[PDB]
Design a protein around this ligand. Structure first.
Ligand SMILES: O=C(O)c1cccc2c1oc1c(C(=O)O)cccc12
Lengths: 115, 114, 114, 115
């Protein structure tokens, strides 16, 4: 599990469950091609998106559908979604944990990278 | 205005208005003595808390009554209040802006020193 | 000034100066078309990006070149850039302030609509 | 483990290791009495601070010595420490995860509360 996404709800103080996440990889033609997708679990985590064999060097985009999440709770959010764009494995394989802390009009995203 | 406090509401995307703020300075006996207080304005800001003459080197505590703010909106918050404790260095012309971004179960505080 | 962008540096506790910002509007063909751009000032702010006449309802993308900012300071950042995508509602007098608090491996973005 | 503290470093993108944490409980005389303390592990987490039997209703203060952490890295931080004050178990026993994301001049703290 070289890529893990964790989403938390800062309004309710709980994991953000059933949040849709789409991952893309920048293609040679500067186009974003679908790479993997899924929904966060009851723990607010999404595991098994890819394997170290498939997760090669490149630029990736993790899109978190925050809008749908807030609408389901009856809250009109500001952002359409949260995006995290980064270069991965440029100096060798690494393990990435992408966390997003969500509020209707604000979100923070942090990355923890290990070997 | 060497010290300014700004409070924002991350739930509504607006300044946090009428938020009580208390500032304390640590006394020689390690006790927190009242220094200044006020409530944020319609812009979520609190100016005029002190003067450069009064704002001497020391350890200060800025307490933001976040609990009362959320209760007024009908939301049960997690924290009793938000606290920012820092040392005023006083090494060259310096203005301190303390900002707090509030959510019911989370808050971030940032300091911009210029 | 219906749209304003503010960028702060959480590592140095100061405004993030000379940060390139590009704004895009989603076109009818779902394509991102250039809308406005500029660089933050000494106060970390970027004003005058557009006018209320030009700023019509739609989906906008604000791209902040955070990578170049950190590289100039000798720090290898995680993100390529920071993106804020939102819908301008245009339902009553509304000013949008988009703020981004930057750290090498983390950033937060908040919107204050007044 | 009704109380867990997690500390992350937003500058290096890693867990904040060996961070001193002191927990206090407000006494009947409005005084902060020592409750528990420890240091974060290699994962940036601190477990085993207390038990559900000892963790009774009350107001608690979790103090994170962020200043020492940054000084060890050669960075002059703004805050003396990070404090999190909250009422716990007022409506029954709950599990609390207190997370702190650290930067030299900024920090965010979030709480995830479960049953
Ligand atoms: O001015 C706004 O509209 C504004 C909006 C959202 C967040 C911040 C703002 O000013 C600051 C400062 C600051 O001014 O020092 C510091 C941290 C966060 C913010």
């Amino acid at each position: 599990c070289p890529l893990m996404v964790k989403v938390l709800d800062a309004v309710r103080g709980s994991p953000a469950i059933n949040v849709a996440v789409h991952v893309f990889r920048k293609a040679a033609d500067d186009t974003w091609e679908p790479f993997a997708s899924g929904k966060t679990s009851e723990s607010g985590e999404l595991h098994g998106l890819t394997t170290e064999e498939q997760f090669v060097e490149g630029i990736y985009k993790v899109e978190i559908d925050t809008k749908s999440y807030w609408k389901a709770l009856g809250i009109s959010p500001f952002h359409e979604h949260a995006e995290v764009v980064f270069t991965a494995n440029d100096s060798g394989p690494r393990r990435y944990t992408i966390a997003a802390l969500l509020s209707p009009y604000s979100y923070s995203t942090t990355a923890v990278v290990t070997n």
